[PDB]
Ligand binder design. Sequence first.
Ligand SMILES: C[C@]12CCc3c(ccc4cc(O)ccc34)[C@@H]1CCC2=O
Ligand SMILES: C[C@]12CCc3c(ccc4cc(O)ccc34)[C@@H]1CCC2=O
Lengths: 124, 124
Amino acid sequence: NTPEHMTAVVQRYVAALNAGDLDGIVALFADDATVEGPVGSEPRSGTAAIREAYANSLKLPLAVELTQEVRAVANEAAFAFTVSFEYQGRKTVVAPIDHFRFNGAGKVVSMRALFGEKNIHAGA
Amino acid sequence: NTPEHMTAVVQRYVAALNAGDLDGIVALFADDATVEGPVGSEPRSGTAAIREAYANSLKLPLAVELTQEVRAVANEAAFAFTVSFEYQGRKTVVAPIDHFRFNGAGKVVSMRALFGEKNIHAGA
Ligand SMILES: C[C@]12CCc3c(ccc4cc(O)ccc34)[C@@H]1CCC2=O
Ligand SMILES: C[C@]12CCc3c(ccc4cc(O)ccc34)[C@@H]1CCC2=O
C-alpha cells in the first residue's frame, strides 16, 4: 500500500466514472467500506449500498477530470477534480475534494467527498 | 458556522502563514484542537503544542497560496495550496491538501495536512 498504488487507484476511480464502469468503481472498495458524499450526509456502508450509491451517480454521463496532482501519504489520498454533466440544456461542473483511506490490502475503506454549493458551477 | 466563514478562516490561515503571524494562526483553533501534519505522523493537541508546531513551521519565510477554490460544507473545509521556501539556494514548493473541521463556535478543532514525497517539488 504505497503512494504509487493509492495514486493509481485514484486514477482508476476517475476513469471508471468517465466510463460508467460500476464494477470497476465498486472493485476499488473493501467489502465493509463506507462512502460519505457530500460530507455531512449519512454514509453508506457495504458493497451493496456502495454500488447503489454510484449507480444513482451514474444516471447521467459524467465527464470527470483530475485538476491537480494526487496527495498520497501513509494510508490516505486526497485529490481535487471536477465532475461535469448536462441536463435539460444546462451544463454543471462540480469541483469536489475527495479523501480516500486505504486498508493494508490496498482497498478503499472510506471515501468522503467534500463540496458545497459554492463548488457547484452551473449556468441558468 | 457557514461555508462563507470556513472559507474566510482558510484565507486568514494562508495569509497568516505568509505574514509569519503565529498569534493569528493559533487564534483560529479551539483550545483543545489537534493538528496532524503530514497525515500519518503523531498529532499535536492543545494551544501550547499547536503554537510550538507552527513556530517550527515558520523558521523560514513561507510563500503560501491557495491554488483552487476552497471546498466548504457542513462543519468542514478542504483546500489545495502551495507552501514555497528557499534554503541554501534551493527553492522548494510543497503542494498539500489540508482538511479543517470546525466546532459550532467556528474555531478549528482539527487540522490535517495531506502531502507525500511526490508533492514536494524541489530542484537539486
Ligand atoms: C456531480 C454530482 C454531485 C457529486 C458527485 C456526483 C457523481 C459522482 C461523484 C463522485 C465523487 O467522487 C464525488 C462527487 C460526485 C454527482 C452526479 C450529479 C451531481 O450533482
Ligand atoms: C512546507 C513544509 C512542510 C509542510 C508545511 C510546512 C509549513 C506550513 C504548513 C502548513 C500547512 O497547512 C501544511 C503544511 C505545511 C513546512 C515548512 C517547511 C516544509 O517542508
